[PDB]
Write a protein that binds this ligand. Structure first.
Ligand code: SAL
Ligand code: FE
Ligand code: FE
Length: 174
């Protein structure tokens, strides 16, 4: 059987869900329970953390512009996803995706991680640039598995304390 259904129009699928592709929600998986994790990610959404994925992530900016703050060779870099752009992020590269624009849409693809394989999340000192905080996590369900992790850091002056210049990372925004 056609487990994931049959083809459907994508433009007008996005439009239908536009109400979920703007915070508090922010994103939307297309199919459930599939090896390819396929999501549309919409703005506005800024975030403070860095994902460390053990596999690859594929981006394709269908609508609006966005960007990825990165960590490269020691410096902090930036990838621009102006509209129309595609990009393939290699594994373990550290990325913080900023979607300033209201009603931007970006297709993001990735693979269900198999048991044994954990993702890291990481925040860095704004000032001394040392790693403030890191959690590794067997990512099973984006929904259930991920917000709580963010709260524990965001609601604790203690974790946000840099183990170098003792400066307290903001957690909320910038
Ligand atoms: O957890 C992810 O792979 C991810 C998904 C969408 C946007 C940014 C990301 O780091
Ligand atoms: Fe990621
Ligand atoms: Fe610091």
């Amino acid at each position: 059987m056609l487990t994931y259904g049959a083809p459907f129009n994508f433009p007008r699928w996005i439009d239908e869900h536009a109400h979920l592709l703007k915070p508090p929600v922010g994103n939307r998986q297309v199919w459930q329970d599939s090896d390819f994790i396929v999501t549309v990610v919409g703005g506005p959404n800024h975030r403070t953390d860095y994902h460390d994925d053990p596999l690859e992530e594929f981006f394709y900016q269908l609508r609006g512009n966005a960007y990825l703050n990165l960590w490269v060779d020691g410096r902090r870099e930036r990838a621009d996803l102006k509209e129309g752009d595609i990009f393939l992020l290699p594994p373990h590269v550290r990325h913080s995706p900023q979607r300033p624009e209201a009603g931007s849409a970006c297709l993001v693809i990735e693979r269900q991680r198999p048991a044994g394989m954990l993702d890291g999340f990481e925040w860095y000192c704004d000032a001394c640039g040392h790693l403030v905080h890191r959690v590794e996590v067997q990512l099973k369900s984006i929904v259930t598995d991920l917000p709580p992790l963010f709260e524990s850091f965001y609601a604790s002056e203690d974790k946000r304390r840099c183990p170098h210049c003792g400066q307290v990372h903001p957690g909320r925004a910038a």
